[PDB]
């Protein structure tokens, strides 16, 4: 049994590597989600994952894809590591030393607690990351940031130390929904697949059920993610509150606009989870001895 420090360090390193690997998918999702915040020409410049990526690299440069990387790295160091270490610790505490088999409720509760703790501490990195990813020189509001640390300085000096935590409640809602949906859907799918013996009770069935659960969770959490992206990237004094933004989005475009960039978000979720899990397990096994 590895100690707490080893688990935390391995989790941090794995999270950082996974975030470094698959950032352009997040950039494409952010670009697609803020496409129609304000009225513009009838011509849509972004359409398709590969199309959006190639347009971004061809027009705004190759380094625009990886804008705001230090903010993501700081978020992974400060938020993800604590989440995926204290999740295991709290889960063991709830189980009370392998007294009983881990029930669904215990895992759900531990995940919700660790997700809330992770979201509350480590919000400014998310805010700055969204601000940097959504900005563009050619169209939209004038770019006001010149990097990541400059964004911190500008927000601290102009807005203060309480405007950095904007939009924490959408993040909490997104985390709770994604966690609960993932767990419930995976459990139900695996149970049904095993009961009807359509597939063998081996790792292929588990992997297929996990992928289905991840897709369902991404599909359910996409609207709240859209609202969060549109609210966080907004000049002060424009949006009154989150419900106002939701009503404006519904009236201006319609319900279909609530599902934007679903494919890039799902791809990022799957890739990040797989890479993080593999690297974390391998590094923990290597460092335990």
């Amino acid at each position: 049994h590895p100690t707490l420090g080893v688990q935390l360090f391995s989790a941090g390193i794995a999270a950082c590597l996974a975030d470094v690997i698959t950032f352009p998918l997040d950039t494409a999702k952010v670009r697609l989600q803020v496409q129609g915040e304000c009225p513009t020409s009838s011509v849509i410049r972004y359409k398709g994952v590969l199309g959006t990526i190639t347009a971004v690299v061809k027009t705004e440069g190759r380094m625009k894809l990886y804008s705001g990387l230090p903010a993501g790295l700081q978020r992974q160091i400060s938020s993800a590591s604590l989440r995926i270490g204290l999740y295991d610790t709290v889960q063991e505490f709830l189980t009370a030393g392998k007294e009983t088999a881990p029930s669904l409720g215990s895992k759900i509760l531990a995940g919700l607690t660790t997700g809330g703790v992770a979201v509350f501490i480590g919000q400014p990195t998310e805010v700055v990351k969204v601000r940097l990813q959504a900005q563009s020189h050619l169209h939209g509001i004038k770019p006001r940031y010149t990097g990541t640390y400059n964004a911190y300085r500008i927000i601290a000096t102009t807005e203060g130390l309480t405007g950095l935590w904007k939009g924490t409640t959408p993040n909490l809602m997104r985390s709770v929904i994604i966690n609960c949906t993932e767990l419930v859907t995976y459990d139900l799918m695996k149970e049904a697949f095993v009961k009807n013996n359509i597939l063998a009770d081996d790792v292929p069935c588990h992997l297929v059920s996990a992928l289905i659960a991840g897709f369902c969770a991404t599909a359910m959490s996409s609207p709240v993610d859209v609202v969060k992206t549109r609210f966080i990237n907004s000049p002060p004094g424009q949006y009154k509150s989150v419900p106002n933004c939701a009503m404006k989005v519904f009236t201006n475009e319609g319900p279909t606009a609530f599902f934007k960039g679903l494919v890039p978000s799902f791809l990022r979720l799957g890739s990040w989870n797989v890479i993080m899990f593999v690297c974390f397990e391998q590094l923990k096994r290597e460092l335990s001895k």
Epitope: N197, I198, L199, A200, D201, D202, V203, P204
Partner: nanobody, 127 residues
Framework: VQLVESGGGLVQAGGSLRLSCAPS????????MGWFRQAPGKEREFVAA???????YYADSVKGRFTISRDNAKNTVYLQMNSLKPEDTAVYYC??????????????????????WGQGTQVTVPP
């Protein structure tokens, strides 16, 4: 792995037989196991198989009579016979395989996936 069976003998019709199969070391908890029988002057056939998770799988001609189970603490697979008949007189082998190879329920029938085969025990039911 030095996987060894036990429980051989000759018994009368209608009896119940308890067959044990255990490997060396403590690697039984991370393996899937299966029982395959060969009739006198015949090739191997599918009898039963239990995966690492713990879901048993039975053959078409053996359903309802066999009962397979595994013990992690004892680290062995135990097979229980019911309503045994001379038609089931054969030599039984237990095979072990690493998890993750099988993708279909019928894929357990293939004998190529298994790699570690034991000595086996001959069970006879004279008429």
């Amino acid at each position: 792995v030095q996987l060894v069976e036990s429980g051989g003998g000759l018994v009368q019709a209608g009896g119940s037989l308890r067959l044990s199969c255990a490997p060396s070391g403590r690697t039984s908890s991370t393996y899937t196991m299966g029982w395959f029988r060969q009739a006198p002057g015949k090739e191997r056939e599918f009898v039963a198989a239990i995966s690492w998770t713990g879901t048993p799988y039975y053959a078409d001609s053996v359903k309802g009579r066999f009962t397979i189970s595994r013990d992690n603490a004892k680290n062995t697979v135990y097979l229980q016979m019911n309503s045994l008949k001379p038609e089931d007189t054969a030599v039984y082998y237990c095979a072990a395989a690493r998890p993750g190879l099988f993708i279909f329920v019928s894929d357990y029938a293939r004998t190529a996936k298994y790699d570690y085969w034991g000595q086996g025990t001959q069970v006879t039911v004279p008429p």
